[PDB]
Every structure is written in C-alpha cells, then in structure tokens.
Amino acid sequence: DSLAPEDGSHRPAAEPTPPGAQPTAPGSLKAPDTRNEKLNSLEDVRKGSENYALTTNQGVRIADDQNSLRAGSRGPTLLEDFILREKITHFDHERIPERIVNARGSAAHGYFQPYKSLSDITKADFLSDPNKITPVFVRFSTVQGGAGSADTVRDIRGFATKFYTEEGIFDLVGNNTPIFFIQDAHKFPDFVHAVKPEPHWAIPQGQSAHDTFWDYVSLQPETLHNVMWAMSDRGIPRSYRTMEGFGIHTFRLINAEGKATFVRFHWKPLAGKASLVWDEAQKLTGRDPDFHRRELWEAIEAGDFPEYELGFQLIPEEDEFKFDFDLLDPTKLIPEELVPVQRVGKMVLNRNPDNFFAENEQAAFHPGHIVPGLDFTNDPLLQGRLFSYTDTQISRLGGPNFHEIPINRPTCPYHNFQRDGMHRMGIDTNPANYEPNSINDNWPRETPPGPKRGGFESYQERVEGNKVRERSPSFGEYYSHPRLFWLSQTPFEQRHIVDGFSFELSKVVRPYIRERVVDQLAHIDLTLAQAVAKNLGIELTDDQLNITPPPDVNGLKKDPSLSLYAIPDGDVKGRVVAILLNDEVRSADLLAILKALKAKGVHAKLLYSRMGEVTADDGTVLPIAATFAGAPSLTVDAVIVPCGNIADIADNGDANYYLMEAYKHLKPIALAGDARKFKATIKIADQGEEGIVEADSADGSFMDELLTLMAAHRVWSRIPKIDKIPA
Amino acid sequence: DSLAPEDGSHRPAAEPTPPGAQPTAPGSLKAPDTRNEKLNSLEDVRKGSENYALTTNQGVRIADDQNSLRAGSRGPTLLEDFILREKITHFDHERIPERIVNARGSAAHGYFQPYKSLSDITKADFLSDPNKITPVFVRFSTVQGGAGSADTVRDIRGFATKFYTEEGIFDLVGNNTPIFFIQDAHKFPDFVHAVKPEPHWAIPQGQSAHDTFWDYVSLQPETLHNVMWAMSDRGIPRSYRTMEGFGIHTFRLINAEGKATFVRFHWKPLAGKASLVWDEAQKLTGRDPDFHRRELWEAIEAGDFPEYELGFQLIPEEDEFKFDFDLLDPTKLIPEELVPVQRVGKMVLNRNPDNFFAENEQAAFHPGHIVPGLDFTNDPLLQGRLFSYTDTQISRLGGPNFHEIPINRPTCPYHNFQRDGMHRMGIDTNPANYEPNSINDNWPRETPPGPKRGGFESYQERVEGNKVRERSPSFGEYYSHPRLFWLSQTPFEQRHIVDGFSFELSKVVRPYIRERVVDQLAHIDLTLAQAVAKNLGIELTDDQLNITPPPDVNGLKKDPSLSLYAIPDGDVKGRVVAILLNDEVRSADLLAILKALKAKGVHAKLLYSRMGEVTADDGTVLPIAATFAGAPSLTVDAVIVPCGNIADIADNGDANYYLMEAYKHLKPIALAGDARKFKATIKIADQGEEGIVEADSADGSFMDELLTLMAAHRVWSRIPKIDKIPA
Numbered sequence A, B: 001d002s003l004a005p006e007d008g009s010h011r012p013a014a015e016p017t018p019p020g021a022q023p024t025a026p027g028s029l030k031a032p033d034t035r036n037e038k039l040n041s042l043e044d045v046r047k048g049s050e051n052y053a054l055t056t057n058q059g060v061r062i063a064d065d066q067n068s069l070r071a072g073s074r075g076p077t078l079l080e081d082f083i084l085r086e087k088i089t090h091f092d093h094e095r096i097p098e099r100i101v102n103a104r105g106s107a108a109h110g111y112f113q114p115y116k117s118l119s120d121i122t123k124a125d126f127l128s129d130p131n132k133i134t135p136v137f138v139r140f141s142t143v144q145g146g147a148g149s150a151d152t153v154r155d156i157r158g159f160a161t162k163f164y165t166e167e168g169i170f171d172l173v174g175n176n177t178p179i180f181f182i183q184d185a186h187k188f189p190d191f192v193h194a195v196k197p198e199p200h201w202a203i204p205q206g207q208s209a210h211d212t213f214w215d216y217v218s219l220q221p222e223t224l225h226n227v228m229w230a231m232s233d234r235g236i237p238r239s240y241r242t243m244e245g246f247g248i249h250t251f252r253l254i255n256a257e258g259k260a261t262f263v264r265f266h267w268k269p270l271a272g273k274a275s276l277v278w279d280e281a282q283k284l285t286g287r288d289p290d291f292h293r294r295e296l297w298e299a300i301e302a303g304d305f306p307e308y309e310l311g312f313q314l315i316p317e318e319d320e321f322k323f324d325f326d327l328l329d330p331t332k333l334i335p336e337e338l339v340p341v342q343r344v345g346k347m348v349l350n351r352n353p354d355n356f357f358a359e360n361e362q363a364a365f366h367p368g369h370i371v372p373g374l375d376f377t378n379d380p381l382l383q384g385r386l387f388s389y390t391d392t393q394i395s396r397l398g399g400p401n402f403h404e405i406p407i408n409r410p411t412c413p414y415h416n417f418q419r420d421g422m423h424r425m426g427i428d429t430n431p432a433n434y435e436p437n438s439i440n441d442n443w444p445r446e447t448p449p450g451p452k453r454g455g456f457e458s459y460q461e462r463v464e465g466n467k468v469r470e471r472s473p474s475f476g477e478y479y480s481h482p483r484l485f486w487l488s489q490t491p492f493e494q495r496h497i498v499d500g501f502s503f504e505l506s507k508v509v510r511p512y513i514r515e516r517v518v519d520q521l522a523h524i525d526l527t528l529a530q531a532v533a534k535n536l537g538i539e540l541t542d543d544q545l546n547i548t549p550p551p552d553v554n555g556l557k558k559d560p561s562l563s564l565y566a567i568p569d570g571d572v573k574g575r576v577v578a579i580l581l582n583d584e585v586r587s588a589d590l591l592a593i594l595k596a597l598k599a600k601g602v603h604a605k606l607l608y609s610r611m612g613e614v615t616a617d618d619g620t621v622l623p624i625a626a627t628f629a630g631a632p633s634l635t636v637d638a639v640i641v642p643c644g645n646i647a648d649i650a651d652n653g654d655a656n657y658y659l660m661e662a663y664k665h666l667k668p669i670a671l672a673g674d675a676r677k678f679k680a681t682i683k684i685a686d687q688g689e690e691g692i693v694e695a696d697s698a699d700g701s702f703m704d705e706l707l708t709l710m711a712a713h714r715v716w717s718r719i720p721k722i723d724k725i726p727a
C-alpha cells in the first residue's frame, strides 16, 4: 500500500552499528560492500523484492492476496483458487528434517588467509600462498537439542568451517573440545541416543542431565575425558567468539614430495576464552534462548568480526608411537606442552547470511570433504564419520544434488559423469555420461597427482592385520586424560566442574547411576570424587579412597592451555555493559562512561523501568534501550550505575535484583556517586571490595578500573561471598 | 556386562506413583492393565526387548556391538561392515520434518463417552450412546516454536483430539482460545511467517515479542481479539490440564432427519482454569523447558488423569444472522451469556504413549476428518484448513499412506480402491482396483446416507453468489470482541494483559510499530491503551483519547466465563508443594503435612541443599527429590517449610531465594515453628499476611489454611507488594 513510516526508520542503515541500535537485517542489505568470491557467486540466486509486483511462483501477478476465491463473499472456498493452493502448498511443505545432531546452529560468511606458504608440509592449495584468500562459511552449533532449542545450554559446541578452495571444498568439522566422548563410530548411535531426549517421553531437551546419559557414561569409561570438559565451564561458552575450536582427529598433511605429517587442527579465538557460569547459562536459556545466535549476528553487524587463528599440532610419522596414548584415539588430546600449536592463518567472519533457511539450514558440512594435500588416518571414529554425512544428507536435503544448493556449491570447477537425481539443476551437454568414452574424447578427464592442481591420491599407508571387530589395546586407558584436564584447571574452574557433575547427577533419578559415576570419578581424582559425592549425599568406600590415581600423561602433571582462565587472554571489544538509568542522570557520568566504553569497542545498553526517554540533569534526552526485566543482567558482561536521582530506582525491585543477579554471576559492577546506595543491596562493605568499582563520580580512573575488571571477565574472588546471597 | 542393580531399582513399579517417586516409563510398561480398543490394536507393532538377542534389522544376531570391522585393530574400517552401515544408516535417517506449526507438543491416550444420546441433534455414532466408549489420542502443543522449543512460552496452545469412532476417525483440532488471529486461510502463511522466527536470522524462538509479529498485528486489526487472549495469562497455562479447549469454527451437527444445527465445540478442564505469571513462565522455559510435557506425563503416571468435558454451543439454523457478529467469523467468539455451553461428554486421558516419536511425532490430525452427523460451514479459515493438513502430511509423513502408521489407523473398517504409494503396508487382494467393477461384484460398495452406519452426504446448503475474492462486510469489525474480553477480566488479569503488551512491545525495535499498536489499543479501551502507552513512554494524542469505544456485543458489557479466575473453579488434586527440609526435621510436622496433602491428592517434593538422604528427629530416613536450585519454586504450586533445625537452612541463599521467588510469583507459603524466621527474607508483615500460613507447628488448621489458599491458585492480593521485592 505504502505502509512504511515516512522518516524511513523501518530500514536499518547499511553501515556497522552497535547491538540494538538498528533493526537487524539480511547480510547483503546490511553490508552490501562486504564481498568475497563465494558471496559474489551467490548473486545469481539472490532475489530482491522492492518495487516488484506480488506473484505466484509461475509469475502471475496477484490482485488480492487477502482473500480466498469463494462463491459469494460468505460462501464456500472454490477448488479453482490456484493462487490460494500454491501459497498454502508452499507453506505446507516449508520444513525439512533437522540435522540428526547439531540441529541448533548459527552461521556466517567470512574469509581465511594463511600467514605463510605451507608448501613444505602440505600441497593443499588454500595453504600455499599468504595472498590467497579462501572464502569460508562457518556454522557454530550445540549438539543435543533440536533446531528450536536454546543456545546457552550445557553441551559440546560444534564448529564447522566450509573452505571454498580452488581445488575443492574442504570442510573442517570440529568441536569446541579437543576430544570426543567415544572411540569407535559404531557406538555413535548408542552415545547419541543416550544423551538425546529419552524415547518414551522425549525429555529432556538440550541437556545431558538425565539417567540415560549418565547410565551410558557410567558403563563406558572412555567417555570420561569429554564429560570432564562438558561439566567444566567449557560446556557453557559466553559466545561462539570466545571458545576454542578443534578438529579432534589426527589427520594427515601430504606435501608435494609425498611425505605424510600427522596433524591435529586447532582454532584459537582472537577474542579470548570466556564462558558463562551455570546458573546464568541456565536462566539465559529462559530469558533469551537465541542469545548466541543473536550475539554472533550483532557482533558481525557491529563490525566486531569473530576472528580465529587456525593452528596445527604437527607430529612426524616416526613419532606415531612416542606418547602414552594413541594418536588415533579421539578420546585423548595432544597436550600443547608436548606438541605446540603452530600458527597457520586467520579466519574472519564478516557477513551474516541473507536467509537463514537457504544458507544456514541447508548448509552441508562433511569431514570427508578433503582436498589434495590432506588425508585421513585410521582413527576409528573418523573412519565411520566418513560414511555418515554423505548418507544423512541424502534424506535431509532431499537427494544427491545437495551440492547444487547455492551455499554448498564449490566456487571452483566441478565436472563428472554423474547424472540425474531429484532436484537436478545442472543441465549436462556432454554427449557422454560414462568414461572411458571416445564420443567426447574422454572429457572430463582424470588428472594425475602432482604438486599443484593434481588429482587426489590416497597416501599409501601400510595396512596389516586380520579383519576384526576389535578395539585396539592402546585405546584402553580412560582416566589419565580426565585427570590431566582436572589438574590443569584453576581452583574456581575445578569448583565449577564439581558443581556441574553434582547438578547433573542430581537430575539422575536412579541413585545407583549416581553412585556408579562417583566410582568412576574416584578413578580420576579423589578430591573431585569426594566433593561430588558430598553434594550427592554419597560416602566413598575405603576401597574408593584407595584407588590409585592414573599416571601423568607423558610426565605432565598439568598443562595450563587446558584451562579457560589460568593464562589471561581477555579481550573487551564486543562485550556489553548494562547502564541502569534514573530520571535525572548525571550527564557528566554518562559522557565519561559512554565514551570510555566506545573507545575500547565495548557496547552499552541504557536500561530503565519503562521504555521511551529519560532526561538527564542538563536536558540531554536519553533513549532507553530496554527495561530492567526486559534485558536482564544475564545478557551483559558488567553493570554500571551512574549518579543522579537514585531514589527514583532505589526501591525498584528489578533494579536491585539486576545488581544481585550480576553480583551472583561474578560480573563487574561500578557505582558512581549516590549509586553507592546500592552497596547495601549486594552487601558491600563501606571500605569496598575487589570487583566493585566505586567513586564520587565516573570521572578519573573509574572507567579504567571497570575496564580492567571486564578484561579479566569475571570476579572469581567473589565466589565465596555469593555462597549466601538470595538471588 | 553393564547390568541392572541387584535390588531391581532400575525399573519403575507398574502401579500409579507420585511425580518423582519412580523413573518414568513407556505407558504399556507403567500401566499394563490400562487398555482401550485403540491401545489394544497397537499390539501388532509393539516390540519388547527383554531376553531377546541384539540383531540387525534383517534378524541377524550381532556378536560385537562395540566395534567396527577393520583390517587390524588399529586399521581402516572396511566397507563390508554391513552391521555398522545398517546401524549408522538408520541413525542418519531418524529425523522427519517437524510440523510446520505446532511442532512442539505432548500427547496421551484416553477415552471419551457422551453423557446422553445426542441423536436428536446429531447422527454421529460416537455421541449416540452413553455406554459406547470411544478411544481418543490427544496432542497438546504450542504453535510457534520448533519441536525442541520450550513448553511454558507465551503462545496459543493447540488441543487436538483424535476420536477413533466406529464410523470413522473424527479429529477435533482446536486451540485453548475460542477465536483465531485471522479471518481467511489465504493469510495463514502471512500471519505464521510474521509470528515465526524472522527469516534473516531465525530469531526469536517461541516468542511473538519481535517486530514482524507486531508489524502484522498493527496492520491487521482482525488479529486484535486473539492478541488480547495471547497477552493475557491464557497465553501461559500452568498445565495442559488447566486450560480450556475450543474448536473455534462454527461447524454443523446433522441429525437423522437431515436437520442442521450450528455448533461450536468446547473443552472444559475438570481440573479448573489456571495459568502461570509471566516472570515465572519465562524463567521456567530456562529451568525446565519440558515442564508441560513432564507435568502431563507425570499426572497420568500418578493417576491424576487429565479430564475434560466436551460441551457444545448450539445455534439453530434460523438464528444464523441474529448476532451483531457473523457466526462464520473465526475472530469472533460466541459469549456464553448469549449461548450456553451444553455439557456433552467426558474425556479422560489415562495412558502415556510407549514411544514418543512413533505415536506422538507421527500422529496426524485433520479438522477435515469428520464423520456422518457432522458437517462444515463456510467459515473461510476452516475452508482453507480442509486443504492444508492433507497436503502437509504427504511430505511430513513421507507419502499418502500415513493412515497406515499405527497411531493414525482407524479401529473401524476401511476399504476402498486406492492403491500403492510410498511405504504401502496394506496388501489388497481385491481383483478390482476401480469402481464400478463387475469382477469383484462392485465391492467394496457405496452406502446410501441414513440414520446410522450410512455413507457421508454433505448438508445441502444453498450457495448463492458470484465467484469473488472478497471478505464478507460482516467480518469487518475488530474491536468489540477485544473490548468484551478486556472488560470481563479481573483487575489483576487486566494488569497482566497490560504487562504482556508492554513487555512484548518493548522488544519491538522499530518504535513506530509500537505506536501503531498503541493506536489500535485506543480503539479497544482507553484505560488499556493508556496503561500500555505509559509503560512504553508514549503519550496518547488528543485524537486517540477521543476515539469512541466499540459497541457492546449484543448488549453485553462483560461475560465472566472469559476470565480465568473471576468464577472460582479451583481443584488442588494433582498440584504439587515443595517441602524445604532441614537436617533434623520435625517428623510431627511432616506427618501432618503429608496426611493433609494426601487427603486432597496434592503431591510433595522434598528438597534440600544436597541430594541423598536426611534423617528426621524420629529416625525417619527421607530421600531428597532435588536441591533448592535443582527444582526451583517455579515447578511447584506452594512452598511449605516444616520446623526442625532451621539454623541448618536459615542462611542458605538458595533456600531464602526459593521463598522470595515463590512469594513474587504469588504462591502460597506455609511456615511452621522456627521456619517463621524466614518471614524476614520476604520483608513482609509482622502480625501476619494473607497468603502466608504460619503456626507454632504444622497441624490440621495449618494445612487447611494452606490447602484453601492452593484451591484459589495464587495470592492475587499480594500483587501490590511484589514490585519492591528484589527477586
């Protein structure tokens, strides 16, 4: 009709803007100048809308899209209404099966570039030149929950990267923890069935806190390593931008000379490692189930591009057997103290999709999608994965032509003799659909392996053994890695691990399962087991107290790289601060607060007891972003309360609870002038306490102190003080 | 190996037990003696497991289900491992498209029986005889969210009942509010797209609190009536057991003499009407996203069978045009003050399914599945619905033979000339697959319509009009029903509606959309409009303040049946109380508490600061159901704190916060003896306060007070006191 407002406020500016400043929008409209080879190649399927007539799918203009065709205006709908029927039919068939695992996921476009040529160790084209840019499409995910499940659950996170290289698609399909729960792919359905919603009633969603998961864990000790990671704060990341990424399996790099080097893939978050605390994460699944999806999208819209450093742990063929653990066992990590991560390149995620369904939901990643210069190994979990993705994608994406779905298409040439299949888009003109052929002079033709642009040839690994359904004896060690992980965590991280196990085991209805898990923990570490046991009202037996701890891992009694927080790596850019306003805010405090945050790329959200505007002490009109209940402290990293008429909000339950919640979840809180009246709400001494910034105004060192706390992420020293506190 | 505990505590007793007393289980194992004709008919496909060997799907016994076949124990997996491939293939193809709408749902089996023969007004066989029982399968659902989204969201709820009648399946596919948002089915995709997650980023899940929903509502005033219901506490039911159900459309009843009677279907919850409060509901989506699913299942295992009374609003054919609203307009309700609901029958849900996916996920309901004695009307929303379910089920359930999926099969005979189609189960022996045929003597044959067991014949409604895509002018009234609903709510219900709109609209990023919705509210009721406007910092214009209120609906200024709470209908059976234990609980208090609770069929959950057991003062060993954090006050209806060693939990932050949350959410709290010291935490009253039961001990009078409060559901009088509490 012409329903947009005349000021054009319905449309977001096509420029980087902080979270909440403008309505979010499709990537190509929000950042039309952000391009890459893949993004450009999707132009052929992008469809606009402005200034076009509304039509059926056959191109017939529709005159009345408000009504069905009927006999009389109060009459029965007629079967000849082909417009109604096409519109309802398309609607009716909108859904496709969600992914069997990792159904819940958020994705974005970006680019990768290596720091230097890696031609000495791999002939992979995308790693051969620092000036060679490779477009990427990355999807981050949870594992257990459906596509409509919540983001901030306790779960492993998926981190899949589709590299659109010049010699083929390479998919690096990893997780946020360096090991997996099981050793052999044949047990994948068992493990996944155990963690997913139980079959009689389909509960619980997005949670491993139920009997079947812990039943399986209790009977399969190989799972303990990854379970330790899931129970730690690693299982509840702050953002996809602040978690590590790992390929898990040992793969191979193959150079032009034919030499194979073992490699484990790593992604280092350039924004640092950061996680939530359980109570916050759990409550956040309720207040904002799309928190991570939203955070990713808004970071990219703000220009806070998620950046990750690709790194390789490289192990020479001759050192295959030099560790206490098997390199092919996916339940074992390779300690960075033993084998350092060599920095390979940077990946920048800088554009959101246009349509979530088309690009995100239909994206298909496969660990078997490798390119010349990479190869597999006999890791028995990897081995089975190679079969699985291929197979699942035929039903999820409706046929064998899912590579023709725009997001999945290679940007490089693809030609072969494969034909037909449902939804076939490519119209082949080749006279031949077989090889060898003479009728097209055998094209397209095979290409011999070579240093560059050659055909794929598998590394000639020697195979010797009998056909057996047997686990290698080298994989039969289940407690040393869990123990190495435990010992590398800080004391507060250890507490969070104990708390994760205790909470989860409390949701296990059959007590003997709890006892059985406690017994497994006693094979890992007595302190851990005792602390969890105490929380479950379980007493360890004398035999359990005497279980000898498992050996160190190749002489290591700890590796600080396994901790989220042992080694400071805090980055404040992209974080957000809640600013609790009052009806006569000290404008000078606001100026100082907002400019200091802006200088470090920290966002702010101005909150009040209602929407609309508040007028500062000098007449400054302040637009309110959200109410205290509307945007809870769960969604921010810190809280600042400026001076002004504090009596306006002093007796406001939400405003007080805002601070109690933020205080409980170890977030920095800064109170200026009369906002110090709020100290009694959170029980802060007159003298003050580490983690609380306070002063007469927000002028001198006030913001620098607050930003130092934000750099350290959370105030871990406050843990004992939050023990009481009714919040 | 991995075997059950020696004591047999791995298996739930096959008798009715209170929630939490036993692990939940498939229905046929929990209640083997509970049967009905449909439940029995599913015996052909039920598969047991105990004492059977593990096999492939082809019946080959598996020797080693822990490993893949490889060449050497550290070698590559072989392609000939057919056991692994079948296992992984089946896993890879587990998912099927979720429902386009109402993907999140919970279902159970039961039975229905009419109170008296309704043969005078309908020839429908299932309503012909009071002693003729009809098996039912019911699915309750949310609408917007995916299958893995949370239960306690603010949304409409679906209430679909499949009646397995002797003359065919009859599906009564309704909702928990008596009207729908839109008028014509042609706009269903528009409305559903507006409320679903926005297309660029697929946010938000299970929420209408986003720009596109309010944008559509603001431009389509026909939606306002159902929006009012959604924003009220109707949008967040406490249980599927405590909400009303409605067919929404006017349908027809056809008796044996051919007389048509207009009818609107109702379901009255025999457990009464009860809803959560927003803060509680939202937080509960985080603490237990499966709350409603769990609550339904546990009520059924406990013997608290959900019971509903089928009721009919009957309007003679001659009275079609006597109201000031059109009967065929699905955005209009028929006030009970004008047309009473006649009680028709009782439906009892007494058994959970065995496998959620097979029975719930694959269940297919259709408003078009009617039987002789029923007929449609020209309601344009209903008309389009007849097309849509059939169509969507062909892709969701993979073919045209979805009626052969066990849960969907009729229990009556079904014979016809339809053949083939994907996954055809029925093997037809008829020599003929067409009619008329002489080769099978024309069987199966058509059956003339008649009083009983006749063929279906449409009521011969007179149709007169031109082929038009036009909305009836009689449907063009959008504010009188919203206003009637508003005026029928209690003052606290009105406040909750205001708060619902205020919350939702604060999440709308484009301010003009908020203003447009406020403008629409001003056409309904100025008090409502002003209350919302004030929360959004919006000022009504002089024109808006002068908008004339819509007329009353046929002289009604209110109708108390539209309120959840105006007319008391409280029923405590099946409700649950949290009991906050201490390490030296007064057994005399527990005795009196449980006795009183037991008499009213109210359950209890014993909570503590740790799991395991606590021993009362008399040596009674009490198993702990959950910790204070583990089962928040959100999950219960009231909280009781017995006396004993109160010092044990007096300074416990979670225990204090438990009471503050329950207090804020208007739940009855009862404190005995030294537990009265907890009154300080909820900063309120000295003498006493209505809603807080207190005494020197938990006695008969103490429990009578608490149970009386529980029968009123929540302590509405405490509302003014909760906005200061920091919780």
Ligand code: HEM
Residues within 6 Å of the ligand: A098, A099, A100, A101, A102, A105, A139, A140, A141, A157, A158, A159, A160, A173, A174, A175, A179, A180, A184, A185, A188, A247, A248, A249, A330, A363, A364, A365, A381, A382, A384, A385, A386, A388, A389, A392, A393, A396, B088, B092
């Ligand atoms: C190291 C262990 C594993 C890792 C790191 C891993 C990682 C992932 C990730 C990140 C995704 C989602 C990709 C996306 O965002 O679309 C995924 C999906 C999937 N995974 Fe794996 N996974 C592992 C083990 C396995 C195993 C053992 C199997 C079966 C043999 C398996 C089968 C699947 C399937 C069927 C999907 C769905 C793919 C689709 O529908 O496109 N995964 N996995």
Ligand code: HEM
Residues within 6 Å of the ligand: A088, A092, B098, B099, B100, B101, B102, B105, B139, B140, B141, B157, B158, B159, B160, B173, B174, B175, B179, B180, B184, B185, B186, B188, B247, B248, B249, B330, B363, B364, B365, B381, B382, B384, B385, B388, B389, B392, B393, B396
């Ligand atoms: C009075 C208005 C409506 C009511 C009360 C209603 C009710 C329901 C319910 C309760 C379900 C879920 C059934 C289950 O539990 O499986 C459902 C599903 C569905 N509804 Fe309706 N609906 C309405 C309007 C419409 C309209 C106008 C259309 C399309 C023209 C439509 C299309 C669908 C579809 C396609 C499904 C999915 C069915 C399946 O996949 O089996 N609905 N509806």
